[PDB]
UniProtKB/Swiss-Prot annotation, chain C:
The chain holds residues 101 to 349 of 1049 of the full protein. Belongs to the resistance-nodulation-cell division (RND) (TC 2.A.6) family. AcrA-AcrB-AcrZ-TolC is a drug efflux protein complex with broad substrate specificity that uses the proton motive force to export substrates. It is found in: Cell inner membrane. Disruption phenotype: Loss of susceptibility to contact-dependent growth inhibition (CDI); inhibiting cells still contact the target. Homotrimer, with large domains that extend into the periplasm, interacts with AcrA and TolC. AcrA may be required to stably link this protein and TolC. Interacts with AcrZ. Part of the AcrA-AcrB-AcrZ-TolC efflux pump. The chain crosses the membrane at residues 237-249. Residues 1-236 are periplasmic. Induction: Positively regulated by MarA, Rob and SoxS transcriptional regulators (at protein level). This is Multidrug efflux pump subunit AcrB. It comes from Escherichia coli (strain K12). It comes from the Bacteria.
Length: 50, 394, 249, 150, 149, 152, 50
């Protein structure tokens, strides 16, 4: 997030366009972490074979 | 340093100019050009599409009289649909090529500017203005631009194509109403000027109802009686003694030139200019040369940038600043877990390792440093960051 | 913003009941605070320009720009933009048997800009080669040109021109506003704020708006800043920042 | 029926000069072509609601309106918050030929175009033709014969 | 227009020529070489594009039953199917990506059971993103949707 | 081939030179009647005029309405050009359809030098336009003391 | 003092036709009674600042 949230900071229509990506992947990634942090351990703990 | 070089050499676009399945064509005729002639040219273009690119074009919709520069008899435009992408595989069957061939053919058409293009990935190079600051007047600003464009021409290296966006001065017909005569013959100047206008320009009288719906009532001369300069005299106006007078009696005419499409920029007279940086060269330098080319012109003439040119002023490159803050907020935010001095730096070294492939894989498929390549970079570095992080952390 | 629209759109509930003379003079709705953020004057160093010249100049080539810039409510102009002025004489008029009405009528008639049409205009008779615009009359541009307006031809043949019974000069639209700077003659831009505007930022824009002008000034003409809120605030924050540092010490 | 200089000086200028104290404008391009038409685009510091941007502009258009000629205001003057690029274009045609071009244009204008024009997101629907009008086509000789003028 | 001194009348049709016609005669359009008119439709800044067109086919869908004989609509210039297709293509890249992931997962963990785990977790993330970027006022556009691949 | 017209239009003296020397019609007339000499005399380019006159381009050529290049030069205050056209045999009393002479015309836009040159080459300070005004008359009515006193 | 047809054709229509490119309207009811009065209500997609 510290590499690409800054790219939301470009002004102009250039940055207008950069905004979409810049945030869309931080959103996608941050939840990606929160879900991987909640769901995946659960699902690992329960569905894997010993 | 391989990265630094391969980076600094790679070209930079905005977005890919994609096959939008549709495109557009420009038909622009010379001075004093008439509707009929334009209609000819439009038919030549339409012909091309319908006959020669049967395989691609799906339908041409073309209009005489609706310029995108703006209206005229001497302007037309063809909206082109294409056949589906499925039903035309191959570059040769893709928009860019189609436009190329199209243009190539239309170049053959004498006595017209016709070319065809795709509308850029932004549905809604430079745009340079030239302002009449000190009130020098249209023919002097004409001269100012003539001098500027034909002195720019002397820099093929620096600037590739410097053209005016407007229409050029064109013949127009001056009538001078002898006031003294008008008064002598007892014919009112209102009656005169109205007669002229209504006959030749047309006049909106009042409204009528046409099948339940209000529309205009226009009075105007039959075509044949307003098609030529000598037709001017044929019109009579009634004087106070009930006696008819011809326009010849109290008018006088002569030909002159003048612009059929004046312009102003921020309330002051201006004339607009288009051009772009020559192959290999940055917009910024092209603009700088134009900036100093302007300085050697008559006094009262100044300049301003608009639109895209105006934008590139606010900022064009902040990447080295905001990637710098990206680099520090990254230098420290990693240590916010490694709780270590300089340990993040180790992960940091790997950042160029990733971008090398990205950079070359663009350069070999001949692609460009664009928004997509940028966001690409961010994702790739972030991934190789993850991989290196997990290694050093373990 | 909306406070404003509600007001002016019902100004246009009223507009067609106000006299022609007042609506053609115009009516304005402006969302203005009450206090000049600054005032910039101009003067000629040489004296080669009278007061009304300065006023015109500002109005005609400075004031539109500064007026457009945001945060700006109503730029007050300390003088007037020029106007063609006809100064009338009752005796001369009477002599030729004329009223101000005949002068006014004549000016409307002979200083007109007339729509005249086109040669070859659509819809045209097929085979037309020439398509051209007709020019008729243009507004007059000069005292001289207003001079030769024709009021009437006398019974004996002789003509009465407007300059024969009136007196034509370029002058202020009003002559009520006379400004002066340091005892030498001047005009200026009294600039107000538009409510909600950013003050320093507005001024920052105003020095910008105005910084592009000087190279096309006539000889002898120079700007000057007799009333300016900003350096108070630059200093007001300078002082606090310095108290802060020395406090940290 | 007005030339470009007329339409510059009598309309375009009496509008520009009345453009003041409106928020956020970057600039004011202004073409004034000889076909008797004006178009003045004001472009605003990006991210500024078009709605109010628009009101400020048109209400001072009405600071100017009573100084523009009768002929031009009775023709109307419009302020539109429009992007520059046709989202689509729909045509109509007669299969039989039983309808000339001007018929089609009218039909669209008179019973299609009002509806489509009202729908939101729509800036200015351009009509590729004209709605009808009662047209009186004048003859100078016949008029003169009876001793008449336009 | 006037009654003559002798009594006779001059009517407007006697000295003028009356017909129904265009308000202007400057704009002449043609489609596929046969004569036509149309609606060039612009956008109002800030408008929703596909939604506007979606409204336009609506606005227009009510018209055909009252058309005169022989009159038919046609769509020579249309941005939308580009965007329907632009999102069709990305959605299909996404699915086939989920496939390919599941293959590299099987080929590495070599068990049907194991491979269910990471597979299930991806959709949850990716649609989850619609939720959050909806809540920041961002649209499911060409750019955004493309970003999520 | 008639690009010569626009050669006179846009200036470009050396392209007029290339074109005149490979055989383009030097008297080619356009949709308004205006020749390259008319065009030059309007947009005030001497050298173009020379390259045109010496090659025997008609000097008394007229457009519709009968306006001479001497008319055009006379109005716009192209004092340099009017002298060269005059030495090349330009009819000084030539009349456009409306009765206007180059003298009248120069007399109306306030060029004192050109009224002199026209009078030196033997203009007629009595020629009457369709409305019967002399060059003198259109000076009194302009309030110009100088032409009137000169045009005695 | 105007009849309903007059007030329909001379006022009401020259207003309706000029209703274009305004946001969010659901419809435009329009009574035109013979007492020389027009009333045209435009109703807007609910929750759209008046």
């Amino acid at each position: 997030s510290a590499v690409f949230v800054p790219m939301a900071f470009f002004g102009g229509s250039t940055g207008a366009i950069y905004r979409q990506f810049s945030i869309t992947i931080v959103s996608a990634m941050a939840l990606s972490v929160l879900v991987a942090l909640i769901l995946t351990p659960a699902l690992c703990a329960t569905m894997l074979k010993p | 340093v391989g990265m630094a070089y391969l980076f600094v050499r790679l070209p930079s676009s905005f977005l890919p100019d994609e096959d939008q399945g549709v495109f557009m064509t420009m038909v622009q005729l010379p001075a004093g050009a008439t509707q009929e002639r334009t209609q000819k040219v439009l038919n030549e273009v339409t012909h091309y599409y319908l006959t020669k690119e049967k395989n691609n074009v799906e339908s041409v919709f073309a209009v005489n009289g609706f310029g995108f520069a703006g209206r005229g008899q001497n302007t037309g435009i063809a909206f082109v649909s294409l056949k589906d992408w499925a039903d035309r595989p191959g570059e040769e069957n893709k928009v860019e090529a189609i436009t190329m061939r199209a243009t190539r053919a239309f170049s053959q058409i004498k006595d017209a500017m016709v070319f065809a293009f795709n509308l850029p990935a932004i549905v809604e190079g430079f745009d340079f203005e030239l302002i009449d600051q000190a009130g020098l007047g249209h023919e002097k600003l004409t001269q100012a631009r003539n001098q500027l464009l034909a002195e720019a021409a002397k820099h093929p290296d620096m600037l590739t194509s410097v053209r005016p966006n407007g229409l050029e001065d064109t013949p127009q017909f001056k009538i001078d109403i002898d006031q003294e005569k008008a008064q002598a013959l007892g014919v009112s100047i209102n009656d005169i000027n109205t007669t002229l206008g209504a006959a030749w320009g047309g006049s909106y009288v009042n409204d009528f109802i046409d099948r339940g719906r209000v529309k205009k009532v226009y009075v105007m001369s039959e075509a044949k009686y307003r098609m030529l300069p000598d037709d001017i005299g044929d019109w009579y106006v009634r004087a106070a003694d009930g006696q008819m007078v011809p326009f010849s009696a109290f008018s006088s005419s002569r030909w002159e030139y003048g612009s059929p499409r004046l312009e102003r920029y921020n309330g002051l007279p201006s004339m607009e200019i288009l051009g772009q940086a020559a192959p290999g060269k940055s917009t910024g330098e092209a603009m700088e040369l134009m900036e100093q080319l302007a300085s050697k012109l008559p006094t009262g003439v100044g300049y301003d940038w608009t639109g895209m040119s105006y934008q590139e002023r606010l900022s064009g490159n902040q990447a080295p600043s905001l990637y710098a803050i990206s680099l520090i907020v990254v230098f420290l935010c990693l240590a916010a877990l490694y709780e270590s001095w300089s340990i993040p730096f180790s992960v940091m070294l790997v950042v160029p390792l990733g971008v090398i492939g990205a950079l070359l894989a663009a350069t070999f498929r001949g692609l460009t440093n664009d928004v997509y390549f940028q966001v690409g970079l961010l994702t790739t570095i972030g991934l190789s960051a993850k991989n290196a992080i997990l290694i050093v952390e373990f | 913003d909306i406070a404003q629209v509600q007001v002016q759109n019902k100004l246009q509930l009223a507009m067609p009941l106000l006299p022609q003379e007042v609506q053609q003079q115009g009516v304005s709705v402006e969302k203005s605070s009450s206090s000049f953020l600054m005032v910039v004057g101009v003067i000629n160093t040489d004296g080669t320009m009278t007061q009304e010249d300065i006023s015109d100049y500002v109005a005609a080539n400075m004031k539109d720009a500064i007026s457009r810039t945001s945060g700006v409510g109503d730029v007050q102009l300390f003088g007037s933009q020029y106007a063609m002025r006809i100064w009338m004489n009752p005796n001369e008029l009477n002599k030729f048997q004329l009223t101000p009405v005949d002068v006014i009528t004549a000016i409307k008639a002979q200083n007109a800009q007339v729509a005249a049409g086109q040669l070859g205009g659509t819809p045209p008779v097929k085979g037309q080669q020439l398509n051209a615009s007709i020019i008729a009359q243009t507004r007059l541009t000069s005292t001289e040109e207003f001079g030769k307006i024709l009021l009437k031809v006398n019974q004996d043949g002789s003509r009465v021109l407007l300059r024969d019974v009136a007196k034509i000069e370029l002058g202020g639209e009003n002559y009520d506003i006379i400004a002066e700077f340091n005892g030498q003659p001047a005009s200026g831009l009294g600039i107000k704020l538009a409510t909600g505007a950013n003050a320093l930022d507005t001024a920052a824009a105003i020095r910008a708006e105005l910084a592009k002008m000087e190279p096309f000034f006539p000889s002898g003409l120079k700007i000057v800043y007799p009333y300016d809120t900003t350096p108070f605030v630059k200093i007001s924050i300078h002082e606090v920042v310095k108290t802060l540092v020395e406090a940290i010490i | 029926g007005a030339d470009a200089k007329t339409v510059q000086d009598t309309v375009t200028q009496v509008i520009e000069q009345n453009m003041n104290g409106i928020d956020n404008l970057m600039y004011m391009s202004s073409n004034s072509d000889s076909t008797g038409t004006v178009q003045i685009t004001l472009t605003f510091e990006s991210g500024t609601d078009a709605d109010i941007a628009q009101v400020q502009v048109q209400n001072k258009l009405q600071l100017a309106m009573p100084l523009l000629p009768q002929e031009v205001q009775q023709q109307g003057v419009s302020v539109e918050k429009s992007s520059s690029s046709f989202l689509m274009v729909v045509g109509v045609i007669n299969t039989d030929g039983t309808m000339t071009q001007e018929d089609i244009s009218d039909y669209v204008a008179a019973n299609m175009k009002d509806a489509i024009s009202r729908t939101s997101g729509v800036g200015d629907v351009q009509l590729f033709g004209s709605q009808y009008a009662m047209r009186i086509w004048m003859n100078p000789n016949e008029l003169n014969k009876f001793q008449l003028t336009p | 227009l006037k009654v003559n001194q002798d009594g006779s009348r001059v009517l407007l049709r006697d000295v003028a020529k009356i017909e129904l016609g265009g308000e202007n005669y400057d704009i002449i359009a043609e489609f596929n070489g046969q004569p036509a008119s149309g609606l060039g439709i612009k956008l109002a800044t800030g408008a929703n594009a596909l939604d506007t067109a979606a409204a336009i086919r609506a606005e227009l869908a009510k018209m055909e039953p009252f058309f005169p004989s022989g009159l038919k609509i046609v769509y020579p210039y249309d941005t939308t199917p580009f965007v329907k297709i632009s999102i069709h293509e990305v959605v299909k890249t996404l699915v086939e990506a989920i496939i390919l992931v599941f293959l590299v997962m099987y080929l590495f963990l070599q068990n049907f059971r194991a491979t269910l785990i990471p597979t299930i977790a991806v959709p949850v993330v990716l649609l989850g993103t619609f939720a959050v970027l909806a809540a920041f006022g961002f649209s499911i556009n060409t750019l955004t949707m493309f970003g999520m691949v | 081939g008639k690009k010569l017209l626009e050669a006179a239009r846009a200036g470009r003296d050396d392209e007029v030179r290339i074109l005149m020397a490979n055989g383009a019609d030097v008297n080619a007339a356009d949709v308004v009647g205006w020749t390259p000499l008319h065009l030059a005399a309007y947009w005030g380019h001497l050298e173009i005029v020379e390259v045109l006159l010496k090659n025997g381009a008609d000097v008394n050529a007229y457009d519709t309405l009968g306006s001479t290049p001497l008319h055009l030069a006379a109005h716009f205050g192209h004092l340099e050009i009017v002298e060269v056209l005059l030495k090349n045999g330009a009819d000084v009393n030539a009349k456009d359809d409306n009765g206007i002479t180059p003298l009248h015309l120069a007399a109306n836009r306030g060029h004192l030098e050109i009224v002199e040159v026209l009078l030196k080459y033997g203009a007629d300070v009595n020629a009457q336009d369709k409305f019967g005004k002399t060059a003198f008359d259109i000076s009194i009515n302009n309030g110009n003391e100088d032409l009137a006193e000169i045009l005695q």
